[PDB]
Amino acid sequence: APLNAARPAEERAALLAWVKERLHEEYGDQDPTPRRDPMHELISTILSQQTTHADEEAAYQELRTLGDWDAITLAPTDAVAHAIRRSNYPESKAPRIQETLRRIKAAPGGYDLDFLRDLPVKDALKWLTDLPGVGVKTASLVLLFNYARPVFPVDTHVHRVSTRVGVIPRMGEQAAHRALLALLPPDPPYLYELHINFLSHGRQVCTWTRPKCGKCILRERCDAYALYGDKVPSFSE
Ligand code: SF4
Ligand SMILES: [Mg+2]
Ligand SMILES: [Mg+2]
């Protein structure tokens, strides 16, 4: 009857703090994220759309056979599209890559994003999300992991576990970025631990279909388990 998702923000923030502590007990400092440098992360994200991880990595490395970022920026777009042919829609991704590189080069510094470290957090997010093919999750991940800014990336795993438990009601993934950050401290190491532990939990236990609730440390405070028991449905749209 009294679901977490309907509780006041202060109670949902305390719930999320409990979740963070329990997941850290389960996973510690285990980190399943790729931990890429910022240029690699941005370009990989552009290539990742509707593409498997193996094909994304292969397309990225084939792209790097064209040379450094300056050479990729200047290469004929068809050469870039051919190089990234393992990813879906290479003809559309090639101009996104070249435009993103052009904009990064024009920013202060070389092919780096260190200038983002000093910008106000919202301005830095907007600068990255303005890049073609780059969304708020990747912008948040780059700022958090590479630059220690207090933002919280929400991927499919974070969104699914948080929503099932009831830390937030059901909403879109972009909205969940604001909603979850509003429940969290401006503490980048804390935000990063929570992000990676959510990823571990979503991959190992709270899976997209048939989650393993009987193996889940969150079970006694999970809205989804309280509503469905051992029949929590797939996390759909
Ligand atoms: S109890 Fe089940 S649905 Fe709830 S967080 Fe754990 S695995 Fe996910
Ligand atoms: Mg530059
Ligand atoms: Mg964008």
Numbering used by the authors: 19 to 255
Paste lines from the article.
Endonuclease III (EndoIII) is a ubiquitous bifunctional DNA glycosylase belonging to the helix-hairpin-helix (HhH)-GDP superfamily of DNA glycosylases. It is active for a broad range of oxidized pyrimidine lesions, removing numerous forms of modified thymine and cytosine bases from DNA, such as thymine glycol (Tg), a major stable oxidative modification of thymine, via the Base Excision Repair (BER) pathway. The crystal structures of EndoIIIs from E. coli (EcEndoIII) D. radiodurans (DrEndoIII1 and DrEndoIII3) and G. stearothermophilus (GsEndoIII) revealed that these enzymes comprise two domains divided by a positively charged DNA binding cleft containing the HhH motif and the catalytic residues Asp and Lys. D. radiodurans possesses three genes encoding EndoIII-like enzymes (DrEndoIII1, DrEndoIII2 and DrEndoIII3), while other bacteria typically possess one.
DrEndoIII1 displays a lower activity towards the common substrates and act mostly as a monofunctional DNA glycosylase. Previous comparative structural analysis suggested that amino acid substitutions in two DNA interacting loops (DIL1 and DIL2) and in the FeS cluster loop (a structurally conserved DNA binding motif) could be the origin of the reduced activity of DrEndoIII1. In DrEndoIII1 we substituted Arg61 and Tyr100 in DIL1 and DIL2 with the equivalent residues found in DrEndoIII2 (Glu and Leu). Compared to previous analysis of wild-type DrEndoIII1, which results in full product formation using the same enzyme and substrate concentration, DrEndoIII1 R61Q processed approximately one-third (25 nM) of the substrate compared to the native enzyme. Our results demonstrate that the affinity of the DrEndoIII1 mutants for the substrates (with THF:G mispair and C:G pair) is reduced when compared with the wild-type enzyme. In the case of the R61Q mutant, this probably originates from the substitution of a positively charged residue with a neutral one. The crystal structures were determined and refined to resolutions of 1.38, 1.95 and 1.89 Å for DrEndoIII1 R61Q, DrEndoIII1 Y100L and DrEndoIII3 G250T/N251H, respectively. Additionally, the DrEndoIII1 R61Q and Y100L crystal structures include two magnesium ions, and the DrEndoIII3 G250T/N251H crystal structure has two chloride ions.
